DNA sequence: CGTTGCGGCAAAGTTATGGGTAAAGTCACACGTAGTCACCATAATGAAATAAGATCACTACTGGGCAGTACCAGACTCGAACTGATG
């Protein structure tokens, strides 16, 4: 969940829209989002930065 | 009474009108009358075009299951051995 948080943070810092697919594409095991909390963490980070 | 003017009566005289008959005029036969633009509405296509419809391609969002792992016994089966009856 942390790693997803820095991934979305860096992606928005560069300028690209941080989506689920883009975040997955740069994380070694892009299937962990089936966990009911990692996706929640990603959505919470997006809402915190405003999506 | 003799004369003179006036008026009725009935042919007689003059116009007019619708008929008939010969005789002076009249006029077409002379290759010829049909013939020709101008006119604006309606059908009637064929082309021009439609306005919507159909499909491709991409982007993002969110359900959500499969190969595999793991335990706790219950229960049947049977090596291996124990032990009793017997001919």
TrEMBL record:
Residue range from the parent sequence: 412 to 462 of 462
Organism taxonomic ancestry: Bacteria, Bacillati, Cyanobacteriota, Cyanophyceae, Nostocales
Protein name: Uncharacterized protein
